[PDB]
Every structure is written in structure tokens, then in C-alpha cells.
């Protein structure tokens, strides 16, 4: 749940902060976190389930990192970042939907979808960052 | 002998160079931060043509372009690889340019149909190779023939095409976007002059130079002390104050037109009548009274105040002339500028030899360690208004603290600056000349009173001297860039009170003020030292943080701190106490890294894995899987036992195994044939023999781990079976699947893509970087006769 | 709109974060953004118009940059920042009021005031940063 | 009041952002502020609560600084930070409760509890940082 929230917060911050013309100092830490998330998620296969009419969806991560060497962000940077942000947002939304439509009697607080169970492994703990909500 | 031994023991813990004065040279040799210019684009990779093989292992008739490290020198062992990357970080930091002018690197493009240019010569070579290549796309060829640079001289901009690996482009673009040069104009230079020298009417500053819009400069890093070396670093602070004292001595002016030593000596001898007394030291009384001593006193006082170096008072108690001059010394110099013991001794000598005997009071039985000084007690115990008021001033004349332009400054009382308080001193000691000295022998009483009058009758000269000393202190303090932190130093500067007497009795009325060039030189030396201090702090912090984030647990921060202290140029590192070294290490660890160095480190850290996997002489691991696995078919090898990942296998970290020394698990798995993956930078043997694959030699390279309990000699076999093999007919002419029980976890080179490598590098067309801003200022000074103090009156009014 | 919001957000961040005694590490990025805004706006003349009873106001931007060589912010730094922040807040409030009182049938989504039209130029896009509201 | 708010804000940020596995770049400025708070509060004695049934609590601050050397935060860092944060949060809650139960007819806007009066000294002004609420 903490890793899923961290993914969602990173993507929300990327949408809000990665804007054309902005100083890179405004997004330096955000871009570092985004690249950390890319590195952690790369090479992993995820599946959001078919419970109900929700479709079975397969997710693959082979994304390159974002640049960190511009003084001010430009149109190319924003477009390149958006291409990755869209896929990550789709994955996060589908994982959230898959987790929302599931319940358990024995342990209802633990993750139910296999995607969130996979994200609860140690290897993904690196994605975890600010939990302010 | 005993005193010498104890002082040597104390001094061996102070990293101050024993020949004090030599420090000056070491302080004046600190040049501004060297301006670095880039001569060629920073490259880690180059394109290279490599043979490729078909799925059947046959070599193709064309080569393919791939990215390969220009210098493939990565060592084996994960820790060694991380050390290599720390060394690369140091190399990049040292070679990082402060500015770039891409036009200097631009070269002719041979294939250009419109007189095109490219940066740099390596780009030209790559472009020519791609142009002549037969497999190049027609569109790419035409683009190379047509890609153009754009030089806008009116805008002072240049854009050049370049071929760069994404990592190389990242580094070069960071260098281009984050240059340290700022525009330079006459307003910047004017504001560079200290604000209190620009407002001084004794100095006429003019700007007789014209700066073009293409004038640039690099701002010195005048960030205040982040290490707080004034707190809990006694030896380092002693060294710092000693060096500052030497510099201030160098810049303090020399007194002119002093009173004739012969005439003053005769006057003092006649007034004191020492020969008529029964003093056991008749000759020693007037020794040390000369112009050289006066100059030494002037320099010592001003330099100690500027450097905030504690002073010790050296005096002979029987020489009451020294005590009388010490009264003036204590009047003008703040009492917190002397070591407590010396101040107590001098004040108690004055009280018990002059003041209390004068008023018939019982001699003070001062107890050392008393929170009150002898003068603080005498102020309450003496009822006379003149002497009591003078004592009150002397008690309360400590330095005041004020921040000017962000620099902490120790400033004097306004009565010291204008020299008015000397009148009170005169008043006080005039009363001492009228006192009875109830039980004192009349000849000795007369001698004391006549010495008191010797100092009293120089009221005008002493007012002039006080104003001159205060003005020189203020003017030279305007040129200090680091906070004037007041701490009691381990070792003091010994001030002979005979030198104070010489200064008091020989000062004339010739005003001497620091020359404008002397002020500029002092300010430049201070700025250079401050900038170097900050830059070396930044370097030390960057390297420590990089070593910690690179997980270089065997790296010793002691060597980093020693290098940092050495580069400060004023520390003899052999004499730095260990506790202070470790405290410095801790304080450096607590600081945050500088933005430029941190960004470069972020680049290196994020590109580490890609740079490592681009090496041809280390593999990322070896999978020992005791089942037969088909040799993968790859364009770069033919058949190769290459693992694309370590999924499905237990991973043993060879670095952790080496460090722990526990080979129980690895030995158990090797003996019991348990599939595993040894992870770590490993050298490997490239075997092209099919007979070696049949003989299964790749599985015979791990028993040495069990035998020697070492993993440094582990060299897995990487099979490269293709048509170039001397026995490829075995693969081609027989129906079998080449397999092996081990795989080498390694990556494949990245293919050269022209679209991904073609960039436009943008810089300025040209500019000139200047270092000595103050060389642009024409500074003159009024005649010394006309020099005025802060109150708009002349410094010396006796004329 | 993005640039106007970025000005407002920068000024709000300056009011909240530039306080006496605060570590400069707390405001380094904020100070950089503020200085970039000052540089971008410096030398530009703006006018907020006289539609209705709204008074015609002229705005000139000639402000010095905020310092960056302190360990902790002090009273001088706060005062120097606060004067500029007050002027910029007045300008932003007047621009927002000018834009709020305007409408058009054809391009109502587009800026209506002359000031916001000026701020929509490319030379002001550098001011743009985090759009999180 | 601003120093108390800064303490509370620093502790909330520490609780939210000092999480296992997070990049140190995500907490660098926060860790600097937290270390500043620790240095400022160390060696100070506070007393909270002598009105009504509010218990008398004595607070002593002797805490070590948080490390700045990790790449990604691990369990040890989080545990040390959590112990320190727990003590500081208890202190802040008690100070707030003590202040909330007091009132003055003459200077009701000024601090009432002796703890907040102590915090209004200059030596604590260094703790002050972003006041965004």
C-alpha cells in the first residue's frame, strides 16, 4: 500500500511539476525519485486480474531514465516524461481498481490483488517515499 | 630547559608552521580558483564496427556499429568497480570546465554541401565513417551532408551538431548549461570593493576602464564557515589566527616621522632620575625604547585585533614606565584581546604599584580565578571620579559585535575611534601625579609621578595615536571576508610593554593610512583564502558523500580530511590532534553536497550500471546450473552461454562472500551441485573452441573457490562459438544442440543509432573571463596630512 | 494562466518559507525560482486596465536578486525579500482582478487582459513551475 | 508560536518522509532541518502542565543527529529517527495542550505557557522554517 501510494504520488508530482520552462532545481529531487521508481520497476512483469468484467491486463516495464542535465525543462523533456507517465499512471490506476474490487475475511487488511502483493516485496521498497496524505 | 620542553610539548599539537613569517608566502600563493576551459567534448563511449553472426553462427558480410568504452579499464570485483567509479567522479570533478566555447572545438565537416561545421573532431570522424558506410540510410547520409551549424554573432550564440552517446551528451550538456561565468560590468566591480572603503573620503576610487558586454567573471565562494572551526578546534583555530596575524602584520603601514629617539630618551632619563634611585635594574629601565619597537607595537596591536589572536603581556613589574604605558594600552585595546592571566597580571601590577599606593589604599590581595579583574574591584574601591571613571571605561571596553555585509566584525567603542577617551586617561593619571603616596619614599614617589606626567603631557600625541590605530584597524577590517570570531587561542602573541612605551613616547603627528593598493592586496588575499576554504570544503564533502553513497566501506575519510587540510596551505598536518581530525570528519559528513558536484555525482551514479555493463573484460556474474541449457544465439557471438538475467536462481554476492570469509554455504552448494548464481564483477575467459564446450571446461572453474576459499581467481568461461572457431564444423556438420551447465551474466553492446546520438550543442560565440576585478579600479589617496577619520575630522590634529 | 499561477505560487512559497532564522537549505530551490522570476520580470512594463471602476495601474519591475550566501536567513534577508514579495503580490492581485472582470464569446478560454496576454509570451515561460492545485 | 509550528511541521514531515527504503535525496533538506532542530533543542529543559489535572511533565533533550551518508534509508536510520520523533512529538503535543488551556486578559495574543515563552527566545529562532498552514 505504501509502495502503491509512492508510485501514485510520484506520478502526480511528475504531472504537476514536470512542466515546460521550469527550472530543473524545481524537480531535481522529483526526477531522482522518478528515476529510482523506473529502475525499481524495470524488468518486472505485472498482471491486473480479471475479477468481474475488469479485463486481464499485462504490464511490462522497460523504460529509460529521465534527463537531469537541463537548466530549464523544455518541450522535448516534457513530452518524453509524459510518454512514461501515461503508462505508469495507467498501471497504477489498474492496480488500484484490481485491489478495490477484492475482499478477504481472514486478513482483509493485507493486499488482495497479486499485483499489490508483488509490490509488497522487499525489492520494491526503494520506490517508497513521502507518505503525507 | 623545563619551560622549553613544556612549550615544545604544547606546540607539537598545533599545526602551525614553525617559521611563522613563512606563512605569509603560503598565504599569498593561494591563487584564485583556476579557470578550466574544455578543449574537446567529454566522451566515455565511441562507435566501433564489430562483426555480426547469423542465427546459424555464420559471420555476416557486414559489420555493425556499437557503442564501446573508449578506455576499457574496469577492474574485477564489485568493490573495485565502485572504487573505479569514485575515481571517475574525481576525474570528472577535476576536469569539469568552468565555461565552454563550442566554436573553439568546431571543425570542418568534409561531407557538408553547405560549409557545415561540427563539434568536435571526434564527431567529424564518426560522421565521415557513417557517411562512407554502405549500410547507412540514404536519409541519414543526406542529413549528414546537409546538417548545419547556426552562429548568431549579434546574439552571441553558436549551435553546432555533435555525435555523442547519451551519457556523453548528458555530461557535455550539464557542462554547457551550468557554466560558472557571470556577466561582468563596472557596477559589479564597484560593488566588489568593500562598502566601507567606497564610503571613505580618504580614498578616491574611479572606473577608468570600459568593460565589453562579453566580459565575464567567476564569483568567489564567500560562504561563511560551515565547519565552525572557531568552536572546539583549538589547534586549527590557533593556526588560522596565527596566519591571519602574519598577513595583517604584512599589510599594516609603517609609522613615519617618529620623535627623535635620542631627544625622547634624554627627556625620559632626566624626568625619571633613575640613577638617583636604588633600583637594582638601572640600565634596563629605558631599554627597548626605539623606533623599531614602536613600529613592532603598532603592527602587533593592529594585526592581533584584525586576526583576533590573543595577546600576552610581557613586562617587568619594577619598570613602572612600562606599567604607565600599559595604562594607555588597556585604555585603547579591548581587554578581551589579552589572555586572562596577562590582563590580570598587568592590571594588578598597575593597581599595586601606582594606583592603590597613590591613594593610600591597602594593596589589593587579588585571588586568581576571581570573576572580577583587579580593575573591576578597584573601580568600586576607588572614590576619585577621574580614576574611577577611567577604570570603568577600561573594564567595559570590550569589542562589540556587528554584522556588516554579512561578515561578523569586532568593532571598537566610538570613544576609542575618535580618541576622546585618552583625555579621561590623562585626567585619571593627572590625578595620580597630584596624589600624596602616603608611605612611599619621596624620591621613588617623584620618579613615579614624573613618569606619569611623561605619559600625561603627550595627551595630544596619544589622542592622535589612538585615532590613527583605530582608523587603520577599521580600514583593514573592511577588507576581511570571514567572520571575526573571538576565541581565546592556545598560544598568544607576546607584546612587550617596552614596545608600548616606545609607541606612546615616539609617535609624532605624521598620519599613515593603508595604501589603496595595500588594501586591495589584503582584500584579495582574504578573498582567495576564503574561496579556497569553501572550495576545499566542497571537494571534501563531495568525495566523502560519494564514497558513502558508493558504499566504499574501506575508504578512510582520514586521508580525505588530511588532503583537505593540506590544500588549505596553512596547516602542518603532522601536528593535528587525532580528536580534532575525527571531529573535522564528522562535521564534514554533516554538511550537504554542493549543487554542481552533487549533480555530477547523480549522473555518474545513474549511469554506473550502464558504464559497467559496457566493459568487455568483466561480466556481471556466473550462473552455475547443473542442467544442460542451450547456448543462446546472439549476433555478437554466434552461440554463447550468456544469461540475460539471474531470475530463477539463488544469488550469492561474491563481495559479501569475500568480506565475511564464510564459505560454508558456497562450499555446500558446490559440493552438492545446487544451482546458484555468483553475482559480482568477474573476469571471464572467452573460449571459441567447440571441443572445449564438449569437454565441459566451463564447469571446472569453481572448485578453486572451495580449495583456496578465495573468489578473486574465479574466471568463468564464456563460450563464443561461431564460424571463426577452428572446429565450427562440429556444430555445422552434426545434428546436436550446443549446451552448457553454466552461463555468464553479461550484457550486449548498445547499437549505434544516428537519430539518438545527433544533438545540437549550444554555447556563446565568445567572451573574456577576468579574475582580478580590482585591477579595473583606479584607486588614489588624499595627502596623509588631509586624511580624516570617521567623524570627518583629521586623524592627527596636533599637526 | 500557468505563468500567472506560477507567479502566485512562487509568492505564496516566498511568504511561507522565507522566514527569519530558517536554514538556507530550506529555501535554496525557492530562492532560485524567485530569482528566476525576478530576472524574467525585470525590465518589463505591465498595465492593468480601467474596465469599469477598476483603476488603471502601471507596473515596473526593477528588483535586485535575493542573496544566496547565508547559512540561516536573518532579518535583512527577510526584509529585502518581503518588499519585493509585497510589490509582486500587488501586481499579481491586480492582474487577476483585471482578468476576472473580462469575457469573450469567441475565445473565452484565452486570456482577455493585456497583462495576461503579455505573460503568455515565450519569454515568461521560464517562470512556470509546479502546477499542483 | 512560529517556532512551535516549525517543530510540529518538522516532526510531521519526518514521520511522513523518513520511511524505510526512501532515497536520501527525498529527505536531504528535511534531515538538515531535523538536525538543526536537534542541535537547537539539545541541552534545554522544559516543563509542561501545572493547570487543572494536566500532569507536570519534564522534558530533557539529549539526542544524536541523523545520518547524512545513506543512499536509501534502511531500518536502522528509520528506527533512530522514529525514537527521536516519538519523543519530540510527545513534547510538542504536551506543549500545545499546556498553551491551549491558558488565557490572559491583557496579552492574550502572547504566549501563556512557560514552555512557549522559552521557545520565543532568539536561540530557538533557528528552528523556524516553512510556515505554510
Curated annotation (Swiss-Prot), chains A, C, D:
Annotated function: Intermediate capsid protein that self assembles to form an icosahedral capsid with a T=13 symmetry, which consists of 230 trimers of VP6, with channels at each of its five-fold vertices. This capsid constitutes the middle concentric layer of the viral mature particle. The innermost VP2 capsid and the intermediate VP6 capsid remain intact following cell entry to protect the dsRNA from degradation and to prevent unfavorable antiviral responses in the host cell during all the replication cycle of the virus.
Region annotated Interaction with the inner capsid protein VP2, chain positions: 62-73
Included stretch of the parent chain: 1 to 133 of 397
Subunit structure and binding partners: Homotrimer. Interacts with the inner capsid protein VP2. Interacts with the outer capsid glycoprotein VP7. Interacts with the outer capsid protein VP5*.
Residues spanning the signal sequence: none
PTMs per UniProt: The N-terminus is blocked.
UniProt similarity note: Belongs to the rotavirus VP6 family.
Further details from the record: The VP6 trimer contains a zinc ion located at the center of the molecule. The zinc ion is not essential for either trimerization or transcription activity of the DLP. Zinc-depleted VP6 has an increased sensitivity to proteases.
Subcellular location(s) per record: Virion
Stated name of the protein: Intermediate capsid protein VP6
Positions in coiled-coil regions: none
Parts of the chain that traverse the membrane: none
Annotated source species: Rotavirus A (strain RVA/Monkey/United States/RRV/1975/G3P5B[3])
Amino acid at each position: 500500500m505504501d509502495v502503491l501510494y509512492s508510485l501514485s504520488k510520484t506520478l502526480k508530482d511528475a504531472r504537476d511539476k514536470i512542466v515546460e520552462g521550469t527550472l530543473y532545481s524545481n524537480v531535481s529531487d522529483l526526477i531522482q525519485q522518478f528515476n529510482q521508481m523506473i529502475i525499481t520497476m524495470n524488468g518486472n512483469e505485472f498482471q491486473t486480474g480479471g475479477i468481474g468484467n475488469l479485463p486481464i491486463r499485462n504490464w511490462n516495464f522497460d523504460f529509460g531514465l529521465l534527463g537531469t542535465t537541463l537548466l530549464n525543462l523544455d518541450a522535448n523533456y516534457v513530452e518524453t516524461a509524459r510518454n512514461t507517465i501515461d503508462y505508469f499512471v495507467d498501471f497504477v490506476d489498474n492496480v488500484c481498481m484490481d485491489e478495490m474490487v477484492r475482499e478477504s475475511q481472514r486478513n482483509g487488511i493485507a493486499p488482495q490483488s497479486d499485483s499489490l502483493r508483488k509490490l509488497s516485496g522487499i525489492k520494491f521498497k526503494r520506490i517508497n517515499f513521502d507518505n503525507s496524505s | 630547559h623545563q619551560k622549553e620542553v613544556q612549550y615544545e610539548i604544547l606546540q607539537k599539537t598545533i599545526p602551525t608552521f614553525e617559521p611563522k613569517e613563512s606563512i605569509l608566502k603560503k598565504l599569498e600563493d593561494i591563487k584564485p580558483e583556476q579557470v578550466k576551459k574544455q578543449t574537446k567534448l567529454f566522451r566515455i563511449f565511441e562507435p566501433r564496427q564489430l562483426p555480426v553472426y547469423r542465427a546459424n553462427g555464420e559471420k555476416e558480410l557486414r559489420n555493425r556499429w556499437y557503442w564501446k568504452l573508449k578506455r576499457d579499464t574496469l577492474p574485477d570485483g564489485d568493490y573495485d568497480v565502485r572504487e573505479y567509479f569514485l575515481n571517475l567522479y574525481d576525474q570528472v570533478l577535476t576536469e569539469m570546465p568552468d565555461y565552454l566555447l563550442l566554436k573553439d572545438m568546431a571543425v570542418e565537416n568534409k561531407n557538408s554541401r553547405d560549409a557545415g561545421k561540427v563539434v568536435d573532431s571526434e564527431t567529424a570522424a564518426i560522421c565521415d565513417a557513417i557517411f562512407q558506410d554502405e549500410e547507412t540510410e540514404g536519409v541519414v547520409r543526406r542529413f549528414i551532408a546537409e546538417m548545419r551549424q547556426r552562429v548568431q554573432a549579434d546574439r552571441n550564440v553558436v549551435n553546432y551538431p555533435s555525435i555523442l552517446h547519451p551519457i556523453d551528451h548528458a555530461f557535455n550538456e550539464y557542462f554547457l548549461q551550468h557554466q560558472l561565468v557571470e556577466p561582468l560590468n563596472n557596477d559589479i566591480i564597484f560593488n566588489y570593493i568593500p562598502e566601507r572603503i567606497r564610503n571613505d573620503v580618504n580614498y578616491i576610487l574611479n572606473m577608468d576602464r570600459n568593460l565589453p558586454s562579453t566580459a565575464r567573471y567567476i564569483r568567489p565562494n564567500l560562504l561563511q564557515d560551515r565547519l565552525n572551526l572557531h568552536d572546539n578546534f583549538e589547534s586549527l583555530w590557533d593556526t588560522i589566527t596565527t596566519s591571519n596575524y602574519i598577513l595583517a602584520r604584512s599589510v599594516v603601514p609603517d609609522l613615519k616621522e617618529l620623535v627623535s629617539t635620542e631627544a625622547q630618551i634624554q627627556k625620559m632619563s632626566q624626568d625619571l632620575q633613575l640613577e638617583a634611585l636604588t633600583i637594582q635594574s638601572e640600565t634596563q629601565f629605558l631599554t627597548g625604547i626605539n623606533s623599531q619597537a614602536a613600529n613592532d607595537c603598532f603592527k602587533t596591536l593592529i594585526a592581533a585585533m584584525l586576526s583576533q589572536r590573543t595577546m600576552s603581556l610581557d613586562f617587568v613589574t619594577t619598570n613602572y614606565m612600562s606599567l604607565i604605558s600599559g595604562m594607555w594600552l588597556l585604555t585603547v585595546v579591548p581587554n578581551d584581546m589579552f589572555i586572562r592571566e596577562s590582563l590580570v597580571a598587568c592590571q594588578l601590577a598597575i593597581i599595586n604599584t601606582i594606583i592603590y599606593p597613590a591613594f593610600g589604599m591597602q594593596r589589593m590581595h587579588y585571588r586568581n580565578g576571581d570573576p572580577q579583574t583587579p580593575f573591576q574591584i578597584a573601580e568600586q574601591q576607588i572614590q576619585n571620579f577621574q580614576v574611577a571613571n577611567w577604570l570603568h571605561f577600561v573594564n567595559n571596553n570590550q569589542f562589540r559585535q556587528v554584522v556588516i555585509d554579512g561578515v561578523l566584525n569586532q568593532v571598537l567603542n566610538d570613544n576609542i575611534r575618535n580618541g576622546h577617551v585618552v583625555n579621561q586617561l590623562m585626567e585619571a593619571l593627572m590625578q595620580l601625579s597630584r596624589q600624596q603616596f602616603p608611605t612611599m619614599p619621596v624620591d621613588y614617589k617623584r620618579s613615579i609621578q614624573r613618569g606619569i606626567l611623561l605619559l600625561s603631557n603627550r595627551l595630544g600625541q596619544l589622542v592622535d595615536l589612538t585615532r590613527l590605530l583605530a582608523y587603520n584597524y577599521e580600514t583593514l577590517m573592511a577588507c576581511i571576508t570571514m567572520n571575526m570570531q573571538h576565541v581565546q587561542t592556545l598560544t598568544t602573541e607576546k607584546l612587550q610593554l617596552t614596545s608600548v612605551t616606545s609607541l606612546c613616547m615616539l609617535i609624532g603627528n605624521a598620519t599613515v593610512i593603508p595604501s589603496p593598493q595595500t588594501l586591495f592586496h589584503y582584500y584579495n588575499v582574504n578573498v582567495n583564502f576564503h574561496s579556497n576554504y569553501n572550495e576545499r570544503i566542497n571537494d571534501a564533502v563531495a568525495i566523502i558523500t560519494a564514497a558513502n553513497r558508493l558504499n566504499l566501506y574501506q575508504k578512510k575519510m582520514k586521508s580525505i580530511v588530511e588532503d583537505f587540510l593540506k590544500r588549505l596551505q596553512i596547516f602542518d598536518i603532522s601536528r593535528v590532534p587525532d580528536d580534532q581530525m575525527y571531529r573535522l570528519r564528522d562535521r564534514l559528513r554533516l554538511l550537504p553536497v554542493e549543487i554542481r558536484r552533487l549533480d555530477i555525482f547523480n549522473l555518474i551514479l545513474m549511469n554506473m550500471e550502464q558504464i559497467e555493463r559496457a566493459s568487455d573484460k568483466i561480466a556481471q556474474g556466473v550462473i552455475i546450473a547443473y542442467r544442460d541449457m542451450q547456448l543462446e544465439r546472439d549476433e555478437m557471438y554466434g552461440y554463447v552461454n550468456i544469461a540475460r538475467n539471474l531470475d530463477g536462481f539463488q544469488q550469492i554476492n561474491l563481495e559479501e562472500l569475500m568480506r565475511t570469509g564464510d564459505y560454508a554455504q558456497i562450499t555446500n552448494m558446490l559440493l552438492n551441485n545446487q544451482p546458484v548464481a555468483l553475482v559480482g564483477a568477474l573476469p571471464f575467459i572467452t573460449d571459441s573452441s567447440v571441443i572445449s564446450l564438449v569437454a565441459k571446461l566451463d564447469a571446472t572453474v569453481f572448485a578453486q573457490i572451495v580449495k583456496l576459499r578465495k573468489v578473486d581467481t574465479l574466471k568463468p568461461i564464456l563460450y563464443k562459438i561461431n564460424s571463426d572457431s577452428n572446429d565450427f564444423y562440429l556444430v555445422a556438420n552434426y545434428d546436436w544442440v550446443p549446451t552448457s551447465t553454466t552461463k555468464v551474466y553479461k550484457q550486449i553492446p548498445q547499437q549505434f543509432d544516428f537519430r539518438a546520438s545527433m544533438h545540437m550543442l549550444t554555447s556563446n560565440l565568445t567572451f573574456t573571463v577576468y579574475s582580478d576585478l580590482l585591477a579595473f579600479v583606479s584607486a588614489d589617496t588624499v595627502e596623509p596630512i588631509n586624511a580624516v577619520a570617521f567623524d570627518n575630522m583629521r586623524i592627527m590634529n596636533e599637526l
